[PDB]
């Protein structure tokens, strides 16, 4: 796996319904290559194996702790965005200055906070669950695992996300009216300059 090569200012990835370790693998390569990646909706990342297998995996991780000073030992983050942050860190040479810089280019969020609610959010085809998992096999959502092990901001995330989807639904209705107006405009402008646009006919889709 190499980088995207798309050389933008920052790519915003909609993490919903992606496989956690396959998403973290691609993002880690992007960060190591110099790209800034913003991951939103980390509460809806999917992990293969249902809730039960994933929950006991975290409980075994929660067992690990420095016997003589626990505040020194492993830090067990409960939020979905910090869980994904730590999964990515495991795939990065983070004790070197290069990996330190790579991990500083990653931003992870639960829900879609501003300004990314009004930007374009992409998907990773080879991390999507619909292309990665057989339809009958078990899986769980990151927010469900996080809620089971101590995360307490699932309700505020859900309430904010409903408000965001209402605003986006209204913006979608407005965009559909402007699209119908556009199609009428290109129809009327088609005849008004009918002769000039003959070269565009064979490549019209």
């Amino acid at each position: 796996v190499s980088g995207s090569g798309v050389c933008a200012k920052r790519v915003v990835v909609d993490a919903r319904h992606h496989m956690l370790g396959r998403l973290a693998s691609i993002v880690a390569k992007e960060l190591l290559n110099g790209q800034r990646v913003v991951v939103v909706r980390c509460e809806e990342i999917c992990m293969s194996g249902g809730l039960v297998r994933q929950k006991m995996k975290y409980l075994r991780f929660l067992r690990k702790r420095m016997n003589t000073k626990p505040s020194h030992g492993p830090i067990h983050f409960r939020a979905p965005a910090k869980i994904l942050w730590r999964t990515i860190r495991g795939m990065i040479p983070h004790k070197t200055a290069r990996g330190e810089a790579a991990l500083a280019r990653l931003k992870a969020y639960e829900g879609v906070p501003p300004p990314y609610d009004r930007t374009k959010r992409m998907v990773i085809p080879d991390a999507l669950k619909v292309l990665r998992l057989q339809p009958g096999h078990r899986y769980c959502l990151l927010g469900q695992l996080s809620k089971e092990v101590g995360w307490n901001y699932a309700d505020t995330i859900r309430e904010l996300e409903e408000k965001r989807k209402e605003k986006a639904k209204v913006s979608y209705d407005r965009r559909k009216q402007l699209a119908k107006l556009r199609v009428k405009a290109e129809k009327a402008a088609e005849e008004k300059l009918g002769t000039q646009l003959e070269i565009l006919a064979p490549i019209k889709y």
Partner: protein, 384 residues
């Protein structure tokens, strides 16, 4: 190898680290859950520990050997004059937790509370809130105040009042700097809370608006400091034999060869006392209201005219002239220490919770010795 005999460990690991508190005034770490059906009310109060005395009462408790018999009980007196509301603070929800939305302050703030904003009040020009007070004079300024309040009603999910004590009423405290705290309003809708807290600006809220007799409350404060202390007193470990070379007031083994480190669970010497503590389920036996018969230490069975203050004053405190609470048992901290009183976080559906207290006698003998008189009048009539 395993230890030869079992005994439980000395001290609790749940109060770690045993350090000095970072604050002096006790802090509410969790307010009661808001029930929007109930009327708007405050959930906490500030008071000052005056002293201890003992009361006698007849117990009504079926099934107990104390039933219909009198008991002697030690009580703590907390002087609680009314608080002044001087502001409002709003909180909105956020994926990172609660966040302060905005705050609105009253036009008039006493110099006692304004001293809280200064390290050296008498060397300064005392400019705090001098320009903020100008919003209440113009008309554009009043528009901002109303706009801030309307923002509170629309966006806030938690509304808290900013209140301060009238610390100069207790002369024996010898302090002019008031104590300031945020108190949550726990009734009604958000618009109800904002309207309720705004009508209280520059107004005195008495202790009876917050608590009632025979209620279980939680007391928050900082315990008495004791400085550097050894393991025997700080943690309660046992002394070593008299024969012990280099002293006997230590822990003998502070760990095994492996792990090759000292653990956080082993008792060590350090700071003892001056810790933040939240103590719950303290019953209110009496509410002494200034200017009423309930302020006196006379009961229905004892008609002797006497005040709550013991003969010669409360030792190291002074005379209680303001409103006060009588509370069963002991209370955190020394005398004069500011204490935070909070409503119970859980439902008090219990016999001890629901018991009705009827006092038979209040001791007002001097606590500075083996006092034997209840009043100065009785002492002078005895000696001629």
């Amino acid at each position: 190898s395993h230890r030869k005999f079992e005994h439980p460990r000395h001290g609790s690991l749940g109060f770690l680290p045993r350090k000095r508190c970072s604050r002096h005034r006790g802090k509410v770490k969790s307010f009661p859950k808001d029930d929007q059906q109930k009327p708007c009310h405050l959930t906490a109060f500030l008071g000052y520990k005056a002293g201890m005395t003992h009361i006698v009462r007849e117990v009504e408790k079926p099934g107990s050997k104390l039933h219909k018999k009198e008991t002697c009980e030690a009580v703590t007196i907390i002087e609680t004059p009314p608080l002044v509301i001087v502001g409002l603070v709003a909180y909105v929800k956020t994926p990172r937790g609660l966040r302060t939305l905005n705050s609105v302050w009253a036009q008039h703030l006493s110099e006692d509370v304004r001293r809280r904003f200064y390290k050296n009040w008498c060397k300064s020009k005392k400019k705090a809130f001098t320009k903020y007070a100008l919003k209440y004079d113009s008309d554009a300024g009043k528009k901002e105040i109303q706009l801030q309040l309307e923002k509170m009603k629309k966006y806030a999910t938690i509304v808290r009042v900013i209140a301060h004590t009238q610390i100069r009423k207790m002369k024996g405290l010898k302090q002019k700097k008031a104590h300031l705290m945020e108190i949550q309003v726990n009734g009604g809708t958000i618009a109800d809370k904002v309207d309720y807290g705004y009508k209280f600006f520059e107004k005195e809220v008495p202790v009876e608006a917050v608590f009632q007799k025979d209620e279980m409350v939680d007391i928050i404060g900082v315990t008495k400091g004791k400085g550097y202390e050894g393991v025997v007193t700080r943690w309660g470990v046992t002394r070593l034999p008299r024969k012990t070379h280099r002293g006997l007031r230590k822990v003998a083994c502070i760990g095994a060869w492996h792990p090759a480190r000292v653990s956080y669970t082993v008792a060590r010497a350090g700071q003892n006392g001056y810790h933040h503590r939240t103590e719950m389920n303290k019953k209110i036996y009496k509410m002494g209201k200034s200017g009423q018969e309930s302020h006196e230490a006379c009961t229905e069975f004892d008609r002797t005219e006497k005040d709550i203050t013991p003969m010669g004053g409360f030792p190291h405190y002074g005379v209680v002239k303001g409103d006060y609470l009588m509370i069963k048992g002991c209370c955190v901290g020394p005398k004069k220490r500011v204490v935070t009183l909070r409503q119970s976080l859980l439902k008090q559906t219990s016999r001890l919770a629901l018991e009705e207290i009827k006092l038979k006698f209040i001791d007002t003998s001097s606590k500075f010795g083996h006092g034997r008189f209840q009043t100065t009048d009785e002492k002078q009539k005895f000696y001629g």
